[PDB]
Amino acid sequence: DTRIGVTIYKYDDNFMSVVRKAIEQDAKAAPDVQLLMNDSQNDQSKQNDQIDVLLAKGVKALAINLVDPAAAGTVIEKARGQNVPVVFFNKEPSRKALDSYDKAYYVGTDSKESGIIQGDLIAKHWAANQGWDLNKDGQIQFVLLKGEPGHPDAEARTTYVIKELNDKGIKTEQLQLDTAMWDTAQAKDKMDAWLSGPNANKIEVVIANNDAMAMGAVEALKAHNKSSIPVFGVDALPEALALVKSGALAGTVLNDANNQAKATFDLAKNLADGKGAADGTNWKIDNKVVRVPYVGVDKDNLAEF
């Protein structure tokens, strides 16, 4: 069988666990393929050693989810010896690293796109629901529940949901913005506080960096008899999708693990086979990179889930 080596930066990452399991399923549908999976345990030196072992096993391609993005060059140098193609995924190597090797590719999507996609989703519903503009000023008076401060996804989603609304011509007024640390109960408490203070009747839209915090806000709104205020999240968790179905959550955003896995596997398998990376697929490779869009989820596409 054609051997393909895969390294996951750490097995205790939820998103990468979904991606890993999807890669494993995809490989099961390719009987000519033997997948050699590795948990790098959040240690780049461990990952580097795991790559040494993979290469001694004659892998025909490497799919590498780096612990340290700066280690791309190190990995490429190992791959060169046997001219093994490398499909980096989820952690983006530098442009210089990708351009250094004719058989280096990347599959992944900037975190800021989750904010952009969430902003577009909010814009979509805002425009379709002019009654949401409670004070009729043409601006969204919002509150924002932020993930852990300094976490790249908290920072990206917070910055870019507002930038994208504003860029789409929708002025916003930030009535409150605080962290609830990705947590449902913390978010419920924070939203409760806001609904008990001077801004209670001014809030038009609740924006959360994830579904957990969105759901806490949903509960707080219900308790204050303000369920008519729309709430938006990110993650497309099943318990959140249940709320999209019931109308309690206005929308959420999928980080598309299945398609990250599929593009990674498809490219790796083609490259292992000595074929063009996108041969027989509909992936768009743009200067060695496949971007996998975040997807806004609401009542239009909910049946797909």
Ligand SMILES: CO[C@@H]1[C@@H](O)[C@H](O)O[C@H](CO)[C@H]1O
């Ligand atoms: C473990 O912390 C994770 C965070 O890394 C992820 O981006 O977003 C998640 C929120 O759904 C957090 O629970």
Ligand SMILES: [Ca+2]
């Ligand atoms: Ca308004």
Ligand code: NA
């Ligand atoms: Na991403």
Ligand code: NA
């Ligand atoms: Na609501």
